[PDB]
Chains A and B, each alone.
Chain A
């Protein structure tokens, strides 16, 4: 489960009608499919760069597969997506790309539709790793590949059923072409996802291919426990729970140092070097230290970690508090999640479920002392009972359990300056209400993307596929100032006149002698910090950052 990696095999048609299309600005379906596969590759390499992807063109004149089969070509075998794999594919884009494919692969050469499915299963069966999921998209612009030969259709159906039984779920992303037919036909009993749809006969547009939301270039999928703690209701009765995190800040992967001449990673070696007398030092002759004024406090390494140990790792329950006492203002860390686990203590789930039921029945939240690791000071936590919420599609959006809420200490609360309470009046609060109602918004969690991360990922894509210019991300968090201004209307000016007063716009060179004379002159004035710093550095005296440091040191030493 945890160590399994999802796997994907594309299946691009290369028929004659697959290439030739309507003569307009619309993309030929082959270019559309290649662009979509390239987009899927790009999305899946930045996000979860461990899955396996491979592309198997069928209908070609050439042939390359583990078992010799006519008109089936495996351009790439199952492996992690790579930049070279993307660049090996973009050469087929455009009319020149179409001609390159025709001269390098071919088209026509009527296929069987069964040996291709067998080949896909072969690569699926050739992997020495785990197989979390197995999927096969079938990019095709035709819906009735056969019909003049029922035997081939029956063989294809049998092979598809065998693949489904093995655990292979194929879903074709149908391509629309001029004409009037993309009918639900000899593909319906083959789609092993069997996605729910109206199954309307007279489709007249591209099928579920825009559903890719092409290039969702930000994701890092993972599920892990992150801790396994004991919840002590008392000294002797303890239960075992896991501490998951539902939302966590996303950061770009750290950079790697490289050797310029060879462009290969350079290993680093941090070690405390000699005391200007030669040799190396022990973790046993280097004690930690701190200085406060003229007093130096010398303290050993282990004693440094000894002074921040209070409790053994676990959640010590200390009582229940009403939910109405958990103010929204107080907040320090992202809220964690607790689920009952039964690996260290058997029977924790039953007590946990009873506690959850009777804790959200009385609208109370458990209060505990939280110590995640061995030597961390305790931190109080209010376990808010989060009841399971489910959609009509039987999809879990808020899984049941307890949610940590880090209550801040009094040290972590800052005090505001005194401000004078000035209240508004009617007849402009109403105007504000009208503006707000005119600016409705159904906020969703899947609304915005980190612009910095998006720009960095696009820059990396441009630097790995020489796109000749980075893709400019549409900054989704940028307000639509012109659209919202036009939607607002002139009532903003009515607001402005109503409250704002009419007059309210809202909108070296130094040496020995000059310093010797200046210390008696006593200014050291227009003398800037940048030039005091360079004087003290080039001369060799000890230097700091605050002005008074240099102003005292130079004055005391230069004369005395």
Chain B
């Protein structure tokens, strides 16, 4: 019946009007191509009938869309396009969710129909901006988000269509300055890898209507001097290829337009434009999630070269530079901003930036003149400057607990610096027990619940989490049965708020924890992930930023030592006999982190890891007063 009806109505739309109820009745009884025939029959007559949404909702029309079938999905999008002009906003909001989870779909015809219905839904829901309904202002926002995500898709014809639609008038103004201002409204942090190339493409596409394409010189085979269009077009073709030249081009265009506005504008309006640009840049730095090095660098660079954009949020700058490993540009921006109260915040952010790339001398230098203005802080920092990490931490904690100091009531920033420096000083010394209590005694009362309290106000994760986890780990490998991360880590492997953060940075620690309670199959994966993360971090670091690449490089010794231990334990061949153990001990005692060149944190990592590996080996199998002899020799080398 349905086959014959579709065949008849393929050329005769007027029929099947009397069979609409019947075909709707049999619609949910099919699962194969007959369902596609039913939807096609429905598609034949959509305009001449009403109350269609009720019937589709009754027949779970939303669910059948999500099934993977090219013809069925295309027909579903087609009927949606046809019946959408008669829809209602409340129903359109429900209908919008299943069609937007479709951008990652192959068969670009479906995407083309998608973007067609989205262009329609964007043109009619633009609205005169009068407050009419929340749904009318929500479906438009959801659709606009998806449309920008369509600027980076494959099938360059579809991308060209979307670009033409976006660059048309009444959406992106043809005026140069207005277009530049409105380009910031098209961020869509879902796409930013190509954002600079697309922005400069939109900026330089308008110049093709410009009435200037002659030879921009007088010609004089010695010279082939040629018109403008032969220089702009290759510039764009190379800008959209790699990001560095695109960043340079966008920065230069921004600077040029900003400089040229000064003629055709007034100061009162100039202030509004600058404030809008600053707000847009703040939104850029706040909403960004996959921090792009060149994009962040370009934003901070154009910010640095303008007196109006120097007031950019220091917390956002610090977070972006730390996450994208682009410290120097943010450092320069903050230093320039500090050259013309909300000043200790800038100093705090600058200290946080400098600490990341070493240069501890400059850190201590700025932790005296600006942060401080007391007498205990100067003495503590002077003690810490020389290799004396006992008096400094002692007097830091003495100054931390006090009801005295009625001579100024030390500021909050100085107290935070006191706590952080005390933690750092405890880390330089081998006082992990003393470090853990003081690191965890800043979020709650005695016996604090280190659970979702650090995972709140991410400053906690930034400051106390690494020291606390390192202290607990080191204490556990010392030999103390004080298991508290095991439950914490195990229940932290849920969601992204406690796993992605715990895997982006801490991977060697996770590998040690997992091979601690032996499930070495996961420890191997964790250590490979850690090596890959280190490789990515090194790749992102500059080439002339010394004392920062060295710091990242000094951990490859520990990484390789743990990897070699995992390989040694996995193969049972080395477990038998004693010559593999003798060879391993000979190799380990031959290569050392050279003295007078490596700070003691690397020494402690290496020695503790080696001692723990020896202890773990001394559970499955002379081989005594020899393993202990190697341990004693390693510790003696540590002392020397």
- Chain A positions near chain B (C-beta within 8 angstroms): 66-67, 121-122, 124-128, 162, 165-166
Contacts and interface: CB of A to CB of B under 8 A. Distances in A.
Interface string B26-43: 111100000000000000
B57 interface: yes
A121 B21 CA distance: 10
Nearest to A162: B21
The 9 closest A-B pairs by CB, nearest first: A125-B25, A67-B58, A162-B21, A122-B58, A166-B25, A66-B58, A67-B57, A67-B54, A125-B28
A128 B60 CA distance: 14
Interface string B404-430: 000000000000000000000000000
A320 B624 CA distance: 109
Interface in B45-64: 54, 57-59
23 contacts: A66-B58, A67-B54, A67-B57, A67-B58, A121-B25, A122-B58, A124-B25, A125-B24, A125-B25, A125-B26, A125-B27, A125-B28, A125-B29, A125-B59, A126-B28, A127-B29, A128-B29, A162-B21, A165-B21, A165-B22, A166-B21, A166-B22, A166-B25
Contacts of A162: 21
A125 B30 CA distance: 11
Contacts of A126: 28
A364 to B, nearest CB: 48
Contacts of B29: 125, 127-128
Contacts of A67: 54, 57-58
A121 B25 CA distance: 8
A126 B57 CA distance: 13
A166 B24 CA distance: 10
Nearest to A130: B29
Nearest to A163: B21
Interface in B1-34: 21-22, 24-29
B1 to A, nearest CB: 12
Contacts of A128: 29
Interface residues of B, number: 12
Among B21, B22, B27, B58, max chain A CB count under 10 A is at B58
Contacts of A66: 58
A362 B70 CA distance: 70
Contacts of A166: 21-22, 25
Main DSSP-derived SS at the A contact region: helix
Nearest to B19: A165
A373 B633 CA distance: 94
Nearest to B57: A67
A166 B21 CA distance: 8
Contacts of B59: 125
Contacts of B24: 125
Among B25, B57, B59, max chain A CB count under 10 A is at B25
A124 B29 CA distance: 11
Contacts of B28: 125-126
Nearest to A115: B54
Nearest to B59: A125
B491 to A, nearest CB: 35
Interface string B155-197: 0000000000000000000000000000000000000000000
Interface in B94-118: none
A77 to B, nearest CB: 14
Contacts of B25: 121, 124-125, 166
A162 B21 CA distance: 7
B362 to A, nearest CB: 67
B88 to A, nearest CB: 14
B544 to A, nearest CB: 66
Nearest to A68: B57
Nearest to B21: A162
A125 B24 CA distance: 9
A127 B29 CA distance: 7
Contacts of A125: 24-29, 59
A126 B24 CA distance: 11
Nearest to A66: B58
A54 to B, nearest CB: 16
Interface string B248-260: 0000000000000
A186 to B, nearest CB: 22
A126 B29 CA distance: 7
A501 to B, nearest CB: 79
Nearest to B53: A67
A126 B27 CA distance: 9
A166 B25 CA distance: 8
B344 to A, nearest CB: 58
Contacts of A121: 25
Contacts of A122: 58
A320 B59 CA distance: 62
Given A125-B28, A127-B29, A128-B29, 14 more contacts: A66-B58, A67-B54, A67-B57, A121-B25, A122-B58, A125-B24, A125-B25, A125-B26, A125-B27, A125-B59, A126-B28, A162-B21, A166-B21, A166-B25
A127 B30 CA distance: 11
A427 B27 CA distance: 79
A302 B188 CA distance: 81
A162 to B, nearest CB: 5
A127 B25 CA distance: 11
A66 B59 CA distance: 9
B53 to A, nearest CB: 10
Contacts of B58: 66-67, 122
Interface string B590-606: 00000000000000000
B363 to A, nearest CB: 64
B30 to A, nearest CB: 10
Contacts of B27: 125
Nearest to A159: B21
A122 B29 CA distance: 12
B50 to A, nearest CB: 13
A117 to B, nearest CB: 12
A484 B228 CA distance: 123
A64 to B, nearest CB: 14
A297 to B, nearest CB: 61
A121 B59 CA distance: 12
A271 B213 CA distance: 98
A125 B56 CA distance: 13
A60 B225 CA distance: 87
Contacts of B21: 162, 165-166
A127 B22 CA distance: 15
A62 to B, nearest CB: 20
Nearest to B24: A125
A122 B27 CA distance: 11
A127 to B, nearest CB: 8
A540 to B, nearest CB: 62
A121 B26 CA distance: 11
Contacts of A127: 29
B41 to A, nearest CB: 16
Nearest to A126: B28
A166 to B, nearest CB: 5
Contacts of B26: 125
A78 to B, nearest CB: 13
Nearest to B18: A165
Contacts of B22: 165-166
B94 to A, nearest CB: 12
Nearest to A129: B29
B461 to A, nearest CB: 45
Nearest to B27: A125
A162 B23 CA distance: 12
A124 B27 CA distance: 12
A124 B26 CA distance: 10
A286 to B, nearest CB: 50
A403 B26 CA distance: 42
A512 B535 CA distance: 99
A67 B55 CA distance: 9
B437 to A, nearest CB: 53
A383 B27 CA distance: 50
B38 to A, nearest CB: 12
Nearest to A128: B29
Nearest to B25: A125
